[PDB]
Design a binder for this molecule. Sequence first.
Ligand code: FMN
Ligand code: SF4
Ligand code: SF4
Ligand code: SF4
Ligand code: SF4
Ligand code: SF4
Ligand code: FES
Ligand code: FES
Lengths: 230, 41, 54, 430, 59, 66, 212
Amino acid sequence: SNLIEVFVDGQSVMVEPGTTVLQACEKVGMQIPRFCYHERLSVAGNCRMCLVEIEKAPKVVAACAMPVMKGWNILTNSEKTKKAREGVMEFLLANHPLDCPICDQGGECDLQDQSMMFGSDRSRFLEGKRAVEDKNIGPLVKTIMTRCIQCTRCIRFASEIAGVDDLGTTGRGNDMQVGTYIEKMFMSELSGNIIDICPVGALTSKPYAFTARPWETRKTESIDVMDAVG
Amino acid sequence: NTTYKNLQHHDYSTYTFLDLNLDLSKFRMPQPSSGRESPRH
Amino acid sequence: KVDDAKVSPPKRAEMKTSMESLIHHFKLYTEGYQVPPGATYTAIEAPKGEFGVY
Amino acid sequence: KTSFGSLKDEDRIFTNLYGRHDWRLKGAQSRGDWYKTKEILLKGPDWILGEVKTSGLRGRGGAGFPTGLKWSFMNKPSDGRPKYLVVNADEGEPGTCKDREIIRHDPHKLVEGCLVGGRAMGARAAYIYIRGEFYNEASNLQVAIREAYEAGLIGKNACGSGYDFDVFVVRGAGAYICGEETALIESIEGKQGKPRLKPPFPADVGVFGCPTTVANVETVAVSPTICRRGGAWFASFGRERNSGTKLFNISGHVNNPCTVEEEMSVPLKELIEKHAGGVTGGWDNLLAVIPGGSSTPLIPKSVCETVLMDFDALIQAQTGLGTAAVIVMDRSTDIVKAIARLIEFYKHESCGQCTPCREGVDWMNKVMARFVRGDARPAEIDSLWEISKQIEGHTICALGDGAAWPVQGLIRHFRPELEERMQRFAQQHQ
Amino acid sequence: RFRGEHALRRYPSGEERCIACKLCEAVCPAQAITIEAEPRADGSRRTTRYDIDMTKCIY
Amino acid sequence: PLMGWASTADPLSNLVLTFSTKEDAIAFAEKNGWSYDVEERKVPKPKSKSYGANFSWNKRTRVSTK
Amino acid sequence: ALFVHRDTPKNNPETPFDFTPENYKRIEAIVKNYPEGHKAAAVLPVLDLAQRQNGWLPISAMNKVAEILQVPPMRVYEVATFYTMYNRKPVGKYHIQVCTTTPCMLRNSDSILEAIQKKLGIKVGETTPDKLFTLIEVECLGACVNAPMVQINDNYYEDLTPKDIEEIIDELKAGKIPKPGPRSGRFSCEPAGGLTSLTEPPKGPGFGVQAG
Ligand SMILES: Cc1cc2nc3c(=O)[nH]c(=O)nc-3n(C[C@H](O)[C@H](O)[C@H](O)COP(=O)(O)O)c2cc1C
Ligand code: SF4
Ligand code: SF4
Ligand code: SF4
Ligand code: SF4
Ligand code: SF4
Ligand code: FES
Ligand code: FES
């Protein structure tokens, strides 16, 4: 009754039809590394880190938005799977400059954890590393658009859930700037909920900005107050 | 025959395309609709 | 040192001109390199005897 | 079969390369267009599909996928949502011109081709996406559609038959990437030109949410003559799989570069010296050959002495065959400068969805600039081999692979010239 | 390469060399490094408190 | 007040215990005397989102910007 | 090159900008070609209508297009930043485009660049000290079959040489427009050798065609 067989590392599992490869691999416990995907946002194919080699298909296919035909064998630990991941991590670290001390999301970046646990060790490419003039989104959200990896996660959240429609891609090639063309404040509801969506340290909180880092501070359960939602 | 039977486009000015679009707009099937007229109406 | 930027931090010139050097430097001095789950014993010949670490 | 083939007249595909009789619905009717095609449309469109799949019409536009299997995928059972035919006419891959001359001289054969294609798959309208650079010939195509609707044989109750069908023109705005499969579709959607992911197919979800298809100018232009001419006798032109004619054009570097219709099987030496003037400096002067527009690795002299112009021999020569640039470049110039110019082109025209083509075209731009100035050690040329092994098969569209391949052409064939350029700059540094 | 005084540095005709990145606290094995950081109205990030226990320093 | 540190009368605040399953947490907390608050565990809720279902013909889910 | 707005008034809405009701009838034809339901897809033809109305576009043009096509304007800012036709800087009347990538540079485009330079006077990428001579070099226009090519406003020019370039610039100063085709004879894209192509006026539908 609506079941599809996928073989993840030889282990068979039945999956509801119409889902993705990534939901099956997370169902059996594997975390395929990802940037552009998020469970509350519609899928794009930008960030490319989701690659995985299905057997007998020589193109390594994206797994963030792969529909599930019947009877797969999905190998997350083959050779060219690892080579594709090392390659994409080798490409991302060019146009993202050295700021990991003065960054605000140093302790909980995504590039850093995935560059340890999946990436390379010795880079290439001597010159390069373009720079972008900073933006002024609003006085509640501090914005440096040089650390932006153009992951295209903020724009989909804006245009779907926020609907304020003041974020856009501009340009082509290496020169793709994410932001407002027209020098206008993005001051609305849930404008503060972009600083945790932005998976690199390019969008952060204004009054918190340069105080602490995610290892000294300790976590504690608490409740949303001043609201009825909780 | 070895003569350029074009050059009818010798002097098509920059509004001739849009005037011709107006010229060819009629006698046309009604461009089918689907529910809403826009996703934000 | 070793041929691996996931164990020892790289040296100064590459740290000042890379990206991966700064990333591995930063995470290697906050978190530290991960160690696979396992129980080992060894003991070497200290001059006092078998200095064992488990 | 055939003894390697050559040119033949009155079995040519389209008339009026330049300056023939007139430009008129009646002139095309006298030449052989618009001829009794209601009986073509009412014999049964599934017979047209069988005719296409039997004739072996190879697909064009830099893909090489067969036309017949694709349009057999284009026979979905009809829903309330209609189906659209989209004729691409964007003119990319420098060394380009395959359809400019056609769309200026005889657009009526394109109109009848998209009419036959729209009746073939149950489609309802043909959107013709022209590159925006082409105001003159676009207005000529507009006057062609004007005269077609003024004769009234297409439109509604078309060809005297109860089957309505319309033909529209949407202009481009200047991009290589609009010519692709699905960035085309979102360029029609009003969004900025960016492709979509391939396992959700444009034959399934397409123009705004209707199943549609996309074809080249040449395949749609030959498509009425496939119906009204001999099945498998069109396939008498060339080898077994790759069959029919193709517009082999020398655009570039000979005496008087130009365009000719030829068969599939044709010797490249005959193509060069017998159809476009002569070689500048003789056959000994030429350095190398590119086929395939510009999305194809180069071909040296010793390979092209024997390897004739065919798809199977070029894929076994690690190359893909396309249109209009089947050309030589001379020994007197810097092919390193030419390839770096091509990489600057692929930087200037590319979107930035996939991080691989963006970052890799950045690296290859800076590295090929440093190779024109000779500013490296051969670890870097092997590094360029590494990056072109990693970009290949990691993107959405084909522009990433098309940017990866000229690096592999340069490395696989002109290695010692790179070594000597680097040694020249080594002596300049030393 | 002796390890002595615990002195700071400053740029050539420039500013404080520390940018308050807490790595010295993250590697201080008796946690003598205590950092509390604040920025200023200029734009460049800074500190408030940078303290060392000379008891807990172990060199 | 001499430095600006954080001094506390909390010996036990630095403890944390890493367990495999909830049953042994219950058993260990009942064994070692002190009371305990069991808060429950919430799974990532499986949602059905896909590409061609996001870019349809008539549905209002249409990103209009990518 | 400066892909943020950066006002500099004579911009900075509301700039005075409006069309003709005749152009509104053109707009009704343009959104009559498209199917209803996805009405907002005419941003590119409407904005190109604005570009051929006013040769450069201000931001109030984009706001007017947002008024007509009832969408939030950020889509229009995306499209205006994306493509290459929409010259968002204020430039002059006539517009020189020197195309040069792969055949064009090896067919002596540098002599063409030097000819445009030492006759016009101003450096590449810039403009002139009036309107009507804005020079850019560009990538492939499509018409690869001949010399490194010149596009002026909806006009192609092939088979170049510096004396014909001086002719073209002199005729732009005199205002007279040249032909819409190449030079060196050959009224279309021709084999300039010995008629290697088809020669004879063809038969037509008369001979044996398979049931047609
Ligand atoms: C990178 C790229 C560039 C393309 N350039 C062109 C082009 O210049 N002209 C064209 O008509 N089609 C072009 N196409 C589309 C091809 O014709 C492709 O085959 C098309 O999607 C389907 O056409 P077919 O019916 O020949 O298979 C291009 C496709 C890609 C992926
Ligand atoms: S976003 Fe990540 S990689 Fe970039 S500076 Fe911040 S911590 Fe470093
Ligand atoms: S600003 Fe952040 S969320 Fe938006 S594209 Fe850049 S990295 Fe992604
Ligand atoms: S390969 Fe480059 S040009 Fe093609 S879709 Fe990806 S980002 Fe765009
Ligand atoms: S916080 Fe510590 S490690 Fe970082 S710059 Fe300051 S003194 Fe150096
Ligand atoms: S104990 Fe002393 S030398 Fe060691 S890290 Fe701490 S402050 Fe530095
Ligand atoms: S997860 Fe981002 S590309 Fe598939
Ligand atoms: S490259 Fe100059 S016309 Fe195509």
